[PDB]
Design a protein around this ligand. Structure first.
Ligand code: NAP
Ligand code: NAP
Ligand code: CA
Ligand code: CA
Lengths: 414, 414
């Protein structure tokens, strides 16, 4: 609509439920008024994905390869109950898995900190950065139900023409169950290691990798060996210069060490662990609504910013019944600022870069000034002691943000 | 030596490193002096397992089936570095996986609480109980290294050999990587559900199950469907009477909800999640050294008690160097007490039951009186502010418990 700064090419991906509502408020009140964009939109709402048989999801991924920058809204991943809810043709796969599998790379997640917000974990005075391997494992697996007594096996047929190898997975003598198979590639694991070592060096913090190699001796063993190998041959000396270090730990030990630490380190996580632990860490610092998530591709030019949390169904349900909601929009806001910032970097656009940072400090300034959504208010007071007066609802908060942004930009221009 | 209370038949499993040292101190100073047990002993130390080609591990599991009660010390699970350390014949599999796979059931883990010990997580004023499915998944999988380009497929064959379903896992056309197969059985998942619903009813607390069914639609979907099914048909009404409830949550949502909760609920976890989260929860309340872990078998008669943590190798290295150490023995002691307490329940042995509870309160009384190992001292003071005078070394702590126990048992008679 009414815009002024030249933003450039950006790939936008619309989402579902509560986040879809918030997403539009962000563009209308915080972005469009000040930035003119060459926008490429792809509606990843559950209805449009079903309509296009999920083709829209693949088109978006490819669009990101071309334009180099994407910003995504949380989306719904269908299970049986969802198929029945929207009368879907199929139980579509996670659009995040599809995008990540096509782009590849590492998803770096970190909390968004405000000085007036108490944490649930007492010692985290420094930031914890998680590097989630964005490829393979459970997010590209094959699983099915075992109908009754029978044999389940997994085989490998070499392109080198030698004899195929067959391994027994299990002999179901009586009754059925379930089975599945998953995998990962060396090249992808290699990129994962490089991005981890590089992130630790740019921050000047130690690096940790977690696996369960004692149980999955071959599978996880490969992650552990590739990391150690690349470290010894290309990064060990650089780490020592900055007096930092790299260590591998069993997932058990790692989550406990993290819990009692004071933060200040990079945490390389396999796909699943990175998925689960980034939520635990976000909640630890305060709220799932306060965290950044950016997929950094192996090219060092392409990026996809997103909100790590989901569509927030519980809040949407309330909305549908006419009950007042107080959903944190910051995570969704920082997906735009982080993306536009990268856009700025790639175009040497100082104005856009200025805008991206300006919106980020306005978000933090607002909350520290005392205006926040219910989740952050519960951090200060106890959830049981939170009063309606301690916070603004979803839309009152977007309005306040809007005014503050308008004031800061004016302050800058004048 | 001495002994006085008739204890009955108990299967003991010796372990490795730091926990092996502690294990002997427990028998010599806390058990043997007051109880004469019919011990059917098995050495699960890494050296004896290698010597017997791991047969000793299977003999122990079978012994537990026969005598109905076992108590186990933490053990080492070999990876390449361990094979080189002890010059092992093979990279032996986890003895815990072997025992659990043979016995089946659910492993219930819970923290051991002391009033004077501060938590890392602020809101947990009530206990969190984890029910870890002890069968299948990653702990009975088939993983291998993929040497180069080729195809990996997984298949199922009815026992009547009439057909064969083949699913494509992945086409490796660029290089190599890894792949694996895993499974589970309906019957085992069914026992898991029943034990979870029953535990919630005996405690009078809500129950939660976590899975990632949105991604592993068939595999995790089966867990979710079996739980809901058994709930609706056999437990829903009983839950409502006690005003409690059951809900399924995505693993993402679950770990975050747990982090900000006040505790007071049963948490049904798939094998892997139960493995990882029980460590995070233990550290949250204070220390990995303060947690109980008991495998409750389907037969509702056989039980296996253990410590949830490992052999504590790091402390063990300082021990070998001839350096003074301070390692929490509490978890190892409760493995003996809960095991003896079950033996008492089965034989209707009142004297033994009194003894088991007496040792448990002595452990708690000692710490609350101000005598503890370094880990607990760091909970009170900050780790950076802990002084030697603030804690006892392992040998000093065991001796203090030993004297306190002597007192209580003397008053328990005189
Ligand atoms: N596209 C994605 O990246 C993504 C990621 C995760 C889940 N999902 C999808 O989202 C749907 C719901 O999944 P879920 O239940 O696990 O949801 P979720 O979106 O992660 O939210 C679960 C809970 O987290 C809290 N929360 C999350 N974001 C919040 C915010 N911005 N402000 C305040 N509180 C927030 C709320 O707790 P209270 O209810 O206690 O306030 C909410 O009920 C599913 O269809 C799922 O597939 C998508
Ligand atoms: N048999 C079992 O049930 C079991 C379970 C887990 C691991 N393991 C085995 O044990 C070995 C070591 O594995 P890991 O490194 O993950 O070890 P771990 O035994 O879990 O200990 C890891 C860290 O946890 C803390 N910790 C654990 N128990 C403690 C106690 N009793 N008192 C005080 N602090 C305690 C220590 O932290 P600080 O160093 O910071 O003090 C220690 O270095 C491996 O060979 C593994 O296969 C066996
Ligand atoms: Ca997540
Ligand atoms: Ca564990």
């Amino acid at each position: 609509m009414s815009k002024k700064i030249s933003g450039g090419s950006v790939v936008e991906m619309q989402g579902d439920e509560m986040t879809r509502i918030i997403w539009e408020l962000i563009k209308e009140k915080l972005i469009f008024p000040y930035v003119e964009l060459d926008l490429h939109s792809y509606d990843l709402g559950i209805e449009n994905r079903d309509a296009t048989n999920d083709q829209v999801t693949k088109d978006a991924a490819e669009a990101i390869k071309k334009h180099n920058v994407g910003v995504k809204c949380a989306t719904i991943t269908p299970d049986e109950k969802r198929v029945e809810e929207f009368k879907l043709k199929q139980m579509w796969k996670s659009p995040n898995g599809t995008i990540r599998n096509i782009l590849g790379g590492t998803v770096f997640r970190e909390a968004i900190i405000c000085k007036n917000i108490p944490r649930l974990v007492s010692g985290w005075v420094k930031p914890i950065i998680i590097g989630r391997h964005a490829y393979g494992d459970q997010y590209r697996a094959t699983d099915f139900v075992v109908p009754g007594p029978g044999k389940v096996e997994i085989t490998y047929t070499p392109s080198d023409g030698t004899q195929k190898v067959t391994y027994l997975v299990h002999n179901f003598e009586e009754g059925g169950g379930v089975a599945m198979g998953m995998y990962n590639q060396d090249k992808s694991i290699e990129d994962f290691a490089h991005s981890s070592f590089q992130m630790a060096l740019s921050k000047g913090w130690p690096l940790y990798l977690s696996t369960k190699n004692t149980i999955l001796k071959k599978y996880d063993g490969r992650f552990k060996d590739i990391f150690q190998e690349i470290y010894d041959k290309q990064y060990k000396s650089q780490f020592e210069a900055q007096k930092i270090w790299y260590e591998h730990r069993l997932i058990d030990d790692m989550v406990a060490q993290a819990m009692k630490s004071e933060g200040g380190f990079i945490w390389a996580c396999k796909n699943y662990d990175g998925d689960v632990q980034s939520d635990s860490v976000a909640q630890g610092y305060g709220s799932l609504g306060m965290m950044t998530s950016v997929l950094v591709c192996p090219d060092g030019k392409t990026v996809e910013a997103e909100a790590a949390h989901g569509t927030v169904t519980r809040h949407y349900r309330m909305y549908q019944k006419g009950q007042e909601t107080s959903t944190n929009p910051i995570a969704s806001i920082f997906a735009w600022t982080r993306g536009l910032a990268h856009r700025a970097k790639l175009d040497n656009n100082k104005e856009l870069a200025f805008f991206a940072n300006a919106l980020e400090e306005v978000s933090i300034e607002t909350i520290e000034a005392g205006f926040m959504t219910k989740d952050l208010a519960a951090c200060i007071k106890g959830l049981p002691n939170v009063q309606r007066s301690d916070y603004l609802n979803t839309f009152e908060f977007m309005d306040k943000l809007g005014e503050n942004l308008k004031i800061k930009l004016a302050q800058a221009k004048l």
